[PDB]
Design an enzyme around this catalytic site. Structure first.
Site, PDB file in Angstrom:
ATOM      1  N   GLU A   1       1.727   7.442  -7.961  1.00 20.26           N
ATOM      2  CA  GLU A   1       1.492   7.571  -6.530  1.00 20.26           C
ATOM      3  C   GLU A   1       1.756   8.988  -6.041  1.00 20.26           C
ATOM      4  OE1 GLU A   1       5.282   5.159  -5.336  1.00 20.26           O
ATOM      5  OE2 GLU A   1       4.993   6.727  -3.808  1.00 20.26           O
TER       6      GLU A   1
ATOM      7  N   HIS B   1       1.824   1.494   3.431  1.00 19.67           N
ATOM      8  CA  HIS B   1       2.990   1.490   2.555  1.00 19.67           C
ATOM      9  C   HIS B   1       4.241   1.759   3.383  1.00 19.67           C
ATOM     10  CE1 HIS B   1       5.829   3.104  -0.516  1.00 19.67           C
ATOM     11  NE2 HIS B   1       5.258   2.189  -1.277  1.00 19.67           N
TER      12      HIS B   1
END
Length: 188
Positions: free
Chosen positions: A73, A102
Site C-alpha cells: 500500500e 481506509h
C-alpha cells in the site's frame, strides 16, 4: 522535488517503473525520523514525504488473491497532518487498486502468553470479524477468544467504533475455556 501523490500519477508511475516515486518512505523509515503513529507529525519530521511501500495483508479478500501474489500500500493525496483515508494498492505482479475509505489503522492485541501482536482493522469492523482476523493471523480459534477493552467485553454484533477503539488502542485476550461451535439466537 516533484511530488507524485495522486491516484492517477502514482498508479501510472508504479506501472511504468515498478517502484514508488521518490517522495515515499516506509513506516520504519518514518519512525526513524520521529513520526509517531496517531500524532499527525509526519510532515513535521519528513516534509514532502508520504508513507508507502509496506505489506497489505488483504485478510478480508477484498483484493484478488493468487498463490505467490503479495500486496503493498501507499498513501495518496497526503501533504500534512494525520494520514488521510486514501490508499493505492499494488501487487507483486503489478495489479493496481485504490480506496478512498481506509479509515482504519493498526491496533494491538495482547495475547494470553504475554505476546502483543499488531492487526490492521477498520472502525466499522464487527467484533466477530476482528476475531476472524486474529484467527487468520495468529491461529487462535474464535471460540478461545474473549476480548476486553477498558473493562468492557467486546460483543459480537457490535463494531470497534461502538467501543471507541482506534489507532494504537490495545485489546486484551482473556481466558475462555468453554469451547463451542456456532450458536444461534432467536430474532423475535
Amino acid at each position: 522535488a516533484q511530488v507524485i501523490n495522486t491516484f492517477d500519477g502514482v498508479a501510472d508511475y508504479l506501472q511504468t517503473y515498478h517502484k514508488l516515486p521518490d517522495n515515499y518512505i516506509t513506516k520504519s523509515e518514518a519512525q526513524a525520523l520521529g513520526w509517531v503513529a496517531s500524532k499527525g507529525n509526519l510532515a513535521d519530521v519528513a516534509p514532502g514525504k508520504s508513507i508507502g511501500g509496506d505489506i497489505f495483508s488483504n485478510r478480508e479478500g477484498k483484493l484478488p488473491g493468487k498463490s505467490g501474489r503479495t500486496w503493498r500500500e501507499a498513501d495518496i493525496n497526503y501533504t500534512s497532518g494525520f494520514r488521510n483515508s486514501d490508499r493505492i494498492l499494488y501487487s507483486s505482479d503489478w495489479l493496481i487498486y485504490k480506496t478512498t475509505d481506509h479509515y482504519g489503522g493498526q491496533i494491538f492485541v495482547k495475547t494470553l502468553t504475554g505476546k502483543t501482536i499488531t492487526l490492521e482493522v477498520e472502525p466499522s469492523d464487527t467484533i466477530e470479524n476482528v476475531k476472524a482476523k486474529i484467527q487468520d493471523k495468529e491461529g487462535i480459534p474464535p471460540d478461545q477468544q474473549r476480548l476486553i477493552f477498558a473493562g468492557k467485553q467486546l460483543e459480537d454484533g457490535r463494531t470497534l467504533s461502538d467501543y471507541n477503539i482506534q489507532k494504537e488502542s490495545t485489546l486484551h485476550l482473556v481466558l475462555r475455556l468453554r469451547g463451542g461451535g456456532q450458536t444461534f439466537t432467536k430474532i423475535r
